[PDB]
Amino acid sequence: ADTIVAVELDTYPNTDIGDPSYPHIGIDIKSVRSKKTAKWNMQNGKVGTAHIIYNSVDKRLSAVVSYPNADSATVSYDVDLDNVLPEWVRVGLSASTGLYKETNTILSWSFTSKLKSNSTHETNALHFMFNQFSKDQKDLILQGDATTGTDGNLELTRVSSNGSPQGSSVGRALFYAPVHIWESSAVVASFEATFTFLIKSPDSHPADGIAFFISNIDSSIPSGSTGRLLGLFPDAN
Amino acid sequence: ADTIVAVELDTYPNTDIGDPSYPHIGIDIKSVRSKKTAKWNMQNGKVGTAHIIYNSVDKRLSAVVSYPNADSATVSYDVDLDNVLPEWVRVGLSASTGLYKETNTILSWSFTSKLKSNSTHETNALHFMFNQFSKDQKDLILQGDATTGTDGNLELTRVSSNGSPQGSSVGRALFYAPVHIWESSAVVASFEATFTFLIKSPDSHPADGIAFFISNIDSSIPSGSTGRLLGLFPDAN
Amino acid sequence: ADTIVAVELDTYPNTDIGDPSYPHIGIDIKSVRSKKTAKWNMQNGKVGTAHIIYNSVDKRLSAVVSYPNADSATVSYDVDLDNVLPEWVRVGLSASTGLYKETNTILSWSFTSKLKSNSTHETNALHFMFNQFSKDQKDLILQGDATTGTDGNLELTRVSSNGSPQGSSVGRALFYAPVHIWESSAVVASFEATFTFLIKSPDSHPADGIAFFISNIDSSIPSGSTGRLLGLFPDAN
Amino acid sequence: ADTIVAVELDTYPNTDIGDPSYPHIGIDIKSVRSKKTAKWNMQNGKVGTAHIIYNSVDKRLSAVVSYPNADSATVSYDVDLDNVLPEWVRVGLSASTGLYKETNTILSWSFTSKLKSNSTHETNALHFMFNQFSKDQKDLILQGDATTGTDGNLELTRVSSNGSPQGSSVGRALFYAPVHIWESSAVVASFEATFTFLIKSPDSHPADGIAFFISNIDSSIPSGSTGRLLGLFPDAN
Ligand SMILES: [Ca+2]
Ligand SMILES: [Ca+2]
Ligand SMILES: [Ca+2]
Ligand SMILES: [Ca+2]
Ligand code: NI
Ligand code: NI
Ligand code: NI
Ligand code: NI
């Protein structure tokens, strides 16, 4: 199966798979059953921003999510990602809907990864920044229902022509280039990711959420991973 | 055929295809017969650095090459690259040898591309930086004789186990992700590239050179493009 | 006197000092009488963005200004800034009003300068980015009527408590650190600046404009440089 | 007195002020008596590199030091720097000698600080990179015996014309602009610093070391802070 590390922005509480009884941000290490969560005061129809950070010295995966005019939510988990993920990965965004639904619109996405070796200084890096997405966005691998270019955004899940979100949808976008997160000469490896999103629903109970994830390079959407599985996991184990 | 824009570091003068009678730096727009050249005081066995810059406002492709302790060489050419290249490209390094030969060793390579739209501000970017190359460098597409990982470098052309360059060799390395160099909302597009290289030969007359190039995404080494064609062109037209 | 290079966003046509008969963007080299202008379809009350670029290989100062949903305006001028400016400079934003007036509100400002030497690679750089300005913004030198922190913005000229712009106002903001734009070992020097602005006026005829400028490090607002002189020049010569 | 946070590269063991009995890297929070140390296999006459990282989510100050061909040393300490340092700081490098001595030569220094607010995204940043230092390096505040420009380097402590280090020397270099490390709207604040150094001594017992430090903006060298006090502290408390 794939290997997944993710930060979930989980809009729907599924208490039988360990969700708390409220929308939450969570750190997912090879399971949808988050290793750590924090309450997230999700705002339907507002643009929010998520930040994810990690480095190999501290071995702590941390995330922060906020909206304008509001306090932030944060979660952290101690994990050595070199013991979870392969040396080469892809990075992506995933989202889903089920019988409950929402738009999962990405307005911007940036990522920076650095590997500093013991040669003088000496730095290896990848950075990308999307503030618009066009119809044929050749540096993204789109999976499932994901599309680019409508209002210049990345729509991870299906939206009707009128703009209404659809249920039973899953989609992902992965950056085209593989990312090197460990190398034998590295003395420090780090990454940072940011994305801005708009989750809107006509309903009092939106579902299911958006995640930033890191995977094996050949990761694909698991069968049946609509809804609570966030397009990331094949089951709720 | 492919579409190629390149900056050549041309170590061998082929006067019947328009080279000046000395090693030179040149700007190549769809032909090995450079549109502009400048004299280049190439130093066998020393590490040099090349810089390439362009933006869509000025429409001027410029390059500078230098060694430590030495003066630089520079060349510029007025060209609207949106009239030459497709909207999506790959970027790469190429080198060749013929009956005359040299090592074509790359010690570092960086690239930055930016597309600024009329949305507030708003910036799209790709950056990469290699200061080492490992054996399985999954974010490079290696073509021909190119290899990575020997002494942590990118060897574009074949080198024997003892370190001696071989003749009749061609190789290229392209960054894995496609690069977006034009978009309909962009108000300014720019790129910059830098690479450090070591060209060494046991011979008084090294050949053939190294180039930084921009191509159609599916570019491959043309048949017969050893030697004076730099792994870039199918003929000398 | 000071030495000034500037890109003006000139909102009021002063035809006796060479302005065209419309709002314009211009390149000013030691004089308010621009060396080059282009028509600028200024939009009262909308947030716009300006970009300024230069490098020492091409010796061309270029600027672009745009609004969302609108075409851009651009201007370029061939000038070797090493023949105009000292080796160390400060960079800043300036604005003014006269008997006609406008707000001169800066929402964001970024700047990057690079000096690449002939040592391997080897790069020297300064970058800053402001997306908010607080009350005590210690890394800006504020001159004249400029203030920071109201609605998190930089107000270059005076605004009343109700938000109404005042006449006969001038103000500037300079980044605190001096900037090195020439060095004897540099093989390429470059800079880029971006700022986002909001010019609003209750009047059909706003005045006077906003400029990005580069000066001697000890530059101060010249006496009498309200209005058409943009806080930059002591006279209209 | 000043407020100092530093990462020390401590070349001389002063066991009565808590140094371990070997050269070490240490985290110093308002005292020379490090809160955490790690063994450092210092190599006389070789160029090394140090990296320092911190963010306000994790509240962990970490450092790594290495040489080419050698293993690294690392140290970390949990500290909320917003409870130690003021909101505005300067950043610097310091070094000293006493009756034992060494050169304290800086070949390169980079720094990046970021403040991400809850406005969309939205980022504030400062970055600088020095890979050479010239005679009149106007963006550095030099204190004590520090000089710039000899062989294009920053010599923090006194070196004779022949290149021999002198005893009883102290010197510092601070970046000219103040740095904003906390702001009330920030959701994440981070910094990273890197420097490359050459510590050489004719002696079997070099002293005293080099530190990267963060201070109140008006920090000056304390009286009597040669030798074991690293130009940072007024006493050994
Ligand atoms: Ca859930
Ligand atoms: Ca040739
Ligand atoms: Ca005017
Ligand atoms: Ca000591
Ligand atoms: Ni959950
Ligand atoms: Ni040629
Ligand atoms: Ni004008
Ligand atoms: Ni110590």
PDB file of N, CA, C and O in Angstrom, chain D residues 161-212:
ATOM      1  N   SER D 161      49.682  41.128  10.624  1.00  0.00           N
ATOM      2  CA  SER D 161      49.907  41.344   9.205  1.00  0.00           C
ATOM      3  C   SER D 161      50.369  40.028   8.571  1.00  0.00           C
ATOM      4  O   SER D 161      50.043  39.698   7.439  1.00  0.00           O
ATOM      5  N   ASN D 162      51.121  39.232   9.320  1.00  0.00           N
ATOM      6  CA  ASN D 162      51.606  37.916   8.899  1.00  0.00           C
ATOM      7  C   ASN D 162      50.514  36.844   9.011  1.00  0.00           C
ATOM      8  O   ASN D 162      50.657  35.687   8.574  1.00  0.00           O
ATOM      9  N   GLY D 163      49.391  37.236   9.601  1.00  0.00           N
ATOM     10  CA  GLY D 163      48.336  36.210   9.729  1.00  0.00           C
ATOM     11  C   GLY D 163      48.273  35.473  11.040  1.00  0.00           C
ATOM     12  O   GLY D 163      47.491  34.564  11.302  1.00  0.00           O
ATOM     13  N   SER D 164      49.069  35.913  11.987  1.00  0.00           N
ATOM     14  CA  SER D 164      49.068  35.239  13.276  1.00  0.00           C
ATOM     15  C   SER D 164      47.993  35.775  14.166  1.00  0.00           C
ATOM     16  O   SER D 164      47.876  37.009  14.320  1.00  0.00           O
ATOM     17  N   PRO D 165      47.192  34.919  14.787  1.00  0.00           N
ATOM     18  CA  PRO D 165      46.181  35.456  15.709  1.00  0.00           C
ATOM     19  C   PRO D 165      46.796  36.092  16.915  1.00  0.00           C
ATOM     20  O   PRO D 165      47.816  35.652  17.426  1.00  0.00           O
ATOM     21  N   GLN D 166      46.108  37.094  17.450  1.00  0.00           N
ATOM     22  CA  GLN D 166      46.516  37.736  18.700  1.00  0.00           C
ATOM     23  C   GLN D 166      45.631  37.357  19.863  1.00  0.00           C
ATOM     24  O   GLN D 166      44.433  37.113  19.695  1.00  0.00           O
ATOM     25  N   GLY D 167      46.230  37.350  21.042  1.00  0.00           N
ATOM     26  CA  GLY D 167      45.534  37.171  22.260  1.00  0.00           C
ATOM     27  C   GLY D 167      44.798  38.421  22.691  1.00  0.00           C
ATOM     28  O   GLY D 167      44.930  39.517  22.107  1.00  0.00           O
ATOM     29  N   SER D 168      44.014  38.245  23.736  1.00  0.00           N
ATOM     30  CA  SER D 168      43.316  39.333  24.426  1.00  0.00           C
ATOM     31  C   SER D 168      42.513  40.207  23.454  1.00  0.00           C
ATOM     32  O   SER D 168      42.544  41.424  23.513  1.00  0.00           O
ATOM     33  N   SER D 169      41.745  39.556  22.575  1.00  0.00           N
ATOM     34  CA  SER D 169      41.000  40.222  21.531  1.00  0.00           C
ATOM     35  C   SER D 169      39.539  39.844  21.623  1.00  0.00           C
ATOM     36  O   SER D 169      39.172  38.746  22.014  1.00  0.00           O
ATOM     37  N   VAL D 170      38.668  40.770  21.234  1.00  0.00           N
ATOM     38  CA  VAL D 170      37.225  40.506  21.162  1.00  0.00           C
ATOM     39  C   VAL D 170      36.681  41.331  20.045  1.00  0.00           C
ATOM     40  O   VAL D 170      37.073  42.491  19.859  1.00  0.00           O
ATOM     41  N   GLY D 171      35.733  40.776  19.283  1.00  0.00           N
ATOM     42  CA  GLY D 171      35.102  41.544  18.225  1.00  0.00           C
ATOM     43  C   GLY D 171      33.798  40.903  17.839  1.00  0.00           C
ATOM     44  O   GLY D 171      33.571  39.697  18.011  1.00  0.00           O
ATOM     45  N   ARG D 172      32.906  41.760  17.286  1.00  0.00           N
ATOM     46  CA  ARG D 172      31.580  41.298  16.881  1.00  0.00           C
ATOM     47  C   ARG D 172      31.175  42.020  15.583  1.00  0.00           C
ATOM     48  O   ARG D 172      31.675  43.104  15.282  1.00  0.00           O
ATOM     49  N   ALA D 173      30.254  41.403  14.882  1.00  0.00           N
ATOM     50  CA  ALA D 173      29.614  41.985  13.715  1.00  0.00           C
ATOM     51  C   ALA D 173      28.110  41.771  13.844  1.00  0.00           C
ATOM     52  O   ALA D 173      27.695  40.634  13.996  1.00  0.00           O
ATOM     53  N   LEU D 174      27.354  42.854  13.764  1.00  0.00           N
ATOM     54  CA  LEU D 174      25.900  42.768  13.840  1.00  0.00           C
ATOM     55  C   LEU D 174      25.299  43.265  12.526  1.00  0.00           C
ATOM     56  O   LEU D 174      25.769  44.248  11.955  1.00  0.00           O
ATOM     57  N   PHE D 175      24.231  42.608  12.061  1.00  0.00           N
ATOM     58  CA  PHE D 175      23.587  43.118  10.871  1.00  0.00           C
ATOM     59  C   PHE D 175      22.949  44.457  11.182  1.00  0.00           C
ATOM     60  O   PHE D 175      22.393  44.697  12.265  1.00  0.00           O
ATOM     61  N   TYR D 176      23.008  45.398  10.237  1.00  0.00           N
ATOM     62  CA  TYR D 176      22.608  46.751  10.496  1.00  0.00           C
ATOM     63  C   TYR D 176      21.115  46.879  10.835  1.00  0.00           C
ATOM     64  O   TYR D 176      20.752  47.650  11.704  1.00  0.00           O
ATOM     65  N   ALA D 177      20.259  46.180  10.077  1.00  0.00           N
ATOM     66  CA  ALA D 177      18.836  46.338  10.348  1.00  0.00           C
ATOM     67  C   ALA D 177      18.396  45.568  11.575  1.00  0.00           C
ATOM     68  O   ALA D 177      18.747  44.403  11.742  1.00  0.00           O
ATOM     69  N   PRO D 178      17.529  46.168  12.411  1.00  0.00           N
ATOM     70  CA  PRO D 178      16.835  45.433  13.461  1.00  0.00           C
ATOM     71  C   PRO D 178      15.959  44.355  12.803  1.00  0.00           C
ATOM     72  O   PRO D 178      15.475  44.529  11.675  1.00  0.00           O
ATOM     73  N   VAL D 179      15.720  43.292  13.551  1.00  0.00           N
ATOM     74  CA  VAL D 179      14.978  42.101  13.123  1.00  0.00           C
ATOM     75  C   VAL D 179      13.775  41.906  14.034  1.00  0.00           C
ATOM     76  O   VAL D 179      13.888  41.967  15.263  1.00  0.00           O
ATOM     77  N   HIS D 180      12.627  41.717  13.424  1.00  0.00           N
ATOM     78  CA  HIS D 180      11.383  41.545  14.133  1.00  0.00           C
ATOM     79  C   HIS D 180      11.094  40.069  14.369  1.00  0.00           C
ATOM     80  O   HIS D 180      10.810  39.360  13.436  1.00  0.00           O
ATOM     81  N   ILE D 181      11.197  39.625  15.610  1.00  0.00           N
ATOM     82  CA  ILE D 181      11.056  38.212  15.902  1.00  0.00           C
ATOM     83  C   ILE D 181       9.753  37.817  16.565  1.00  0.00           C
ATOM     84  O   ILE D 181       9.434  36.626  16.697  1.00  0.00           O
ATOM     85  N   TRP D 182       8.932  38.783  16.919  1.00  0.00           N
ATOM     86  CA  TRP D 182       7.619  38.554  17.463  1.00  0.00           C
ATOM     87  C   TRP D 182       6.738  39.680  16.969  1.00  0.00           C
ATOM     88  O   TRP D 182       7.173  40.831  16.928  1.00  0.00           O
ATOM     89  N   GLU D 183       5.517  39.361  16.631  1.00  0.00           N
ATOM     90  CA  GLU D 183       4.530  40.401  16.387  1.00  0.00           C
ATOM     91  C   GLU D 183       3.192  39.821  16.789  1.00  0.00           C
ATOM     92  O   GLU D 183       2.961  38.615  16.724  1.00  0.00           O
ATOM     93  N   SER D 184       2.288  40.706  17.229  1.00  0.00           N
ATOM     94  CA  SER D 184       1.086  40.226  17.835  1.00  0.00           C
ATOM     95  C   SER D 184       0.176  39.418  16.908  1.00  0.00           C
ATOM     96  O   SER D 184      -0.597  38.564  17.392  1.00  0.00           O
ATOM     97  N   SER D 185       0.242  39.644  15.601  1.00  0.00           N
ATOM     98  CA  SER D 185      -0.550  38.889  14.631  1.00  0.00           C
ATOM     99  C   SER D 185       0.165  37.653  14.082  1.00  0.00           C
ATOM    100  O   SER D 185      -0.431  36.923  13.271  1.00  0.00           O
ATOM    101  N   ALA D 186       1.421  37.430  14.477  1.00  0.00           N
ATOM    102  CA  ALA D 186       2.144  36.298  13.883  1.00  0.00           C
ATOM    103  C   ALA D 186       1.537  34.988  14.377  1.00  0.00           C
ATOM    104  O   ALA D 186       1.293  34.850  15.583  1.00  0.00           O
ATOM    105  N   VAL D 187       1.372  34.063  13.472  1.00  0.00           N
ATOM    106  CA  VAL D 187       0.982  32.713  13.788  1.00  0.00           C
ATOM    107  C   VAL D 187       2.164  31.767  13.788  1.00  0.00           C
ATOM    108  O   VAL D 187       2.109  30.712  14.466  1.00  0.00           O
ATOM    109  N   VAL D 188       3.221  32.094  13.053  1.00  0.00           N
ATOM    110  CA  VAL D 188       4.489  31.365  13.141  1.00  0.00           C
ATOM    111  C   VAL D 188       5.594  32.366  12.883  1.00  0.00           C
ATOM    112  O   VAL D 188       5.480  33.220  12.000  1.00  0.00           O
ATOM    113  N   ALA D 189       6.646  32.306  13.677  1.00  0.00           N
ATOM    114  CA  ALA D 189       7.847  33.098  13.514  1.00  0.00           C
ATOM    115  C   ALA D 189       8.988  32.053  13.421  1.00  0.00           C
ATOM    116  O   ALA D 189       9.036  31.121  14.232  1.00  0.00           O
ATOM    117  N   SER D 190       9.936  32.288  12.586  1.00  0.00           N
ATOM    118  CA  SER D 190      11.065  31.381  12.474  1.00  0.00           C
ATOM    119  C   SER D 190      12.317  32.133  12.097  1.00  0.00           C
ATOM    120  O   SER D 190      12.256  33.200  11.476  1.00  0.00           O
ATOM    121  N   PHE D 191      13.447  31.533  12.417  1.00  0.00           N
ATOM    122  CA  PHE D 191      14.694  32.020  11.859  1.00  0.00           C
ATOM    123  C   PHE D 191      15.639  30.839  11.585  1.00  0.00           C
ATOM    124  O   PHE D 191      15.533  29.755  12.190  1.00  0.00           O
ATOM    125  N   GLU D 192      16.550  31.121  10.701  1.00  0.00           N
ATOM    126  CA  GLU D 192      17.632  30.202  10.383  1.00  0.00           C
ATOM    127  C   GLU D 192      18.873  31.034  10.115  1.00  0.00           C
ATOM    128  O   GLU D 192      18.810  32.090   9.513  1.00  0.00           O
ATOM    129  N   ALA D 193      20.015  30.534  10.579  1.00  0.00           N
ATOM    130  CA  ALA D 193      21.265  31.193  10.324  1.00  0.00           C
ATOM    131  C   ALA D 193      22.285  30.119   9.953  1.00  0.00           C
ATOM    132  O   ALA D 193      22.259  29.011  10.459  1.00  0.00           O
ATOM    133  N   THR D 194      23.222  30.521   9.103  1.00  0.00           N
ATOM    134  CA  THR D 194      24.334  29.672   8.728  1.00  0.00           C
ATOM    135  C   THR D 194      25.568  30.521   8.685  1.00  0.00           C
ATOM    136  O   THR D 194      25.527  31.653   8.197  1.00  0.00           O
ATOM    137  N   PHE D 195      26.708  29.979   9.124  1.00  0.00           N
ATOM    138  CA  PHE D 195      27.945  30.687   8.898  1.00  0.00           C
ATOM    139  C   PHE D 195      29.045  29.648   8.666  1.00  0.00           C
ATOM    140  O   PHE D 195      28.997  28.528   9.187  1.00  0.00           O
ATOM    141  N   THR D 196      30.031  30.054   7.884  1.00  0.00           N
ATOM    142  CA  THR D 196      31.219  29.255   7.631  1.00  0.00           C
ATOM    143  C   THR D 196      32.395  29.986   8.257  1.00  0.00           C
ATOM    144  O   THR D 196      32.501  31.212   8.168  1.00  0.00           O
ATOM    145  N   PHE D 197      33.268  29.208   8.882  1.00  0.00           N
ATOM    146  CA  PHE D 197      34.311  29.764   9.689  1.00  0.00           C
ATOM    147  C   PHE D 197      35.616  28.997   9.510  1.00  0.00           C
ATOM    148  O   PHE D 197      35.598  27.815   9.172  1.00  0.00           O
ATOM    149  N   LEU D 198      36.679  29.664   9.838  1.00  0.00           N
ATOM    150  CA  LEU D 198      38.028  29.085   9.838  1.00  0.00           C
ATOM    151  C   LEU D 198      38.690  29.510  11.141  1.00  0.00           C
ATOM    152  O   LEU D 198      39.045  30.675  11.337  1.00  0.00           O
ATOM    153  N   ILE D 199      38.851  28.543  12.034  1.00  0.00           N
ATOM    154  CA  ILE D 199      39.539  28.732  13.280  1.00  0.00           C
ATOM    155  C   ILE D 199      40.886  28.020  13.128  1.00  0.00           C
ATOM    156  O   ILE D 199      40.932  26.812  12.949  1.00  0.00           O
ATOM    157  N   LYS D 200      41.952  28.848  13.210  1.00  0.00           N
ATOM    158  CA  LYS D 200      43.293  28.284  13.118  1.00  0.00           C
ATOM    159  C   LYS D 200      44.156  28.890  14.195  1.00  0.00           C
ATOM    160  O   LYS D 200      44.150  30.056  14.479  1.00  0.00           O
ATOM    161  N   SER D 201      45.054  28.077  14.705  1.00  0.00           N
ATOM    162  CA  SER D 201      45.941  28.528  15.762  1.00  0.00           C
ATOM    163  C   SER D 201      47.260  27.825  15.596  1.00  0.00           C
ATOM    164  O   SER D 201      47.300  26.648  15.215  1.00  0.00           O
ATOM    165  N   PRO D 202      48.361  28.500  15.962  1.00  0.00           N
ATOM    166  CA  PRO D 202      49.638  27.791  15.968  1.00  0.00           C
ATOM    167  C   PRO D 202      49.763  26.874  17.130  1.00  0.00           C
ATOM    168  O   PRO D 202      50.751  26.146  17.198  1.00  0.00           O
ATOM    169  N   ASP D 203      48.866  26.833  18.059  1.00  0.00           N
ATOM    170  CA  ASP D 203      48.915  26.217  19.324  1.00  0.00           C
ATOM    171  C   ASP D 203      48.027  24.972  19.431  1.00  0.00           C
ATOM    172  O   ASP D 203      46.964  24.846  18.797  1.00  0.00           O
ATOM    173  N   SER D 204      48.444  24.045  20.276  1.00  0.00           N
ATOM    174  CA  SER D 204      47.679  22.869  20.565  1.00  0.00           C
ATOM    175  C   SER D 204      46.363  23.167  21.272  1.00  0.00           C
ATOM    176  O   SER D 204      45.446  22.372  21.164  1.00  0.00           O
ATOM    177  N   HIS D 205      46.303  24.300  21.947  1.00  0.00           N
ATOM    178  CA  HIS D 205      45.139  24.705  22.714  1.00  0.00           C
ATOM    179  C   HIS D 205      44.630  26.060  22.189  1.00  0.00           C
ATOM    180  O   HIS D 205      44.987  27.128  22.717  1.00  0.00           O
ATOM    181  N   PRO D 206      43.821  26.039  21.160  1.00  0.00           N
ATOM    182  CA  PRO D 206      43.209  27.305  20.672  1.00  0.00           C
ATOM    183  C   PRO D 206      42.214  27.818  21.707  1.00  0.00           C
ATOM    184  O   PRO D 206      41.668  27.064  22.522  1.00  0.00           O
ATOM    185  N   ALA D 207      41.932  29.117  21.642  1.00  0.00           N
ATOM    186  CA  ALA D 207      40.838  29.692  22.426  1.00  0.00           C
ATOM    187  C   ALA D 207      40.427  30.993  21.740  1.00  0.00           C
ATOM    188  O   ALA D 207      41.228  31.586  21.020  1.00  0.00           O
ATOM    189  N   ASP D 208      39.197  31.493  21.995  1.00  0.00           N
ATOM    190  CA  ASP D 208      38.171  30.973  22.886  1.00  0.00           C
ATOM    191  C   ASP D 208      36.917  30.456  22.201  1.00  0.00           C
ATOM    192  O   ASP D 208      36.199  29.656  22.803  1.00  0.00           O
ATOM    193  N   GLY D 209      36.616  30.938  21.012  1.00  0.00           N
ATOM    194  CA  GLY D 209      35.501  30.464  20.227  1.00  0.00           C
ATOM    195  C   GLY D 209      34.803  31.567  19.457  1.00  0.00           C
ATOM    196  O   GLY D 209      35.194  32.741  19.476  1.00  0.00           O
ATOM    197  N   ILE D 210      33.737  31.111  18.784  1.00  0.00           N
ATOM    198  CA  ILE D 210      32.887  31.962  17.948  1.00  0.00           C
ATOM    199  C   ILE D 210      31.462  31.686  18.382  1.00  0.00           C
ATOM    200  O   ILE D 210      31.110  30.547  18.675  1.00  0.00           O
ATOM    201  N   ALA D 211      30.598  32.721  18.361  1.00  0.00           N
ATOM    202  CA  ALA D 211      29.185  32.503  18.634  1.00  0.00           C
ATOM    203  C   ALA D 211      28.339  33.268  17.609  1.00  0.00           C
ATOM    204  O   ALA D 211      28.656  34.372  17.195  1.00  0.00           O
ATOM    205  N   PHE D 212      27.194  32.665  17.291  1.00  0.00           N
ATOM    206  CA  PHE D 212      26.080  33.371  16.672  1.00  0.00           C
ATOM    207  C   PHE D 212      25.165  33.828  17.807  1.00  0.00           C
ATOM    208  O   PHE D 212      24.845  33.042  18.692  1.00  0.00           O
TER     209      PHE D 212
END
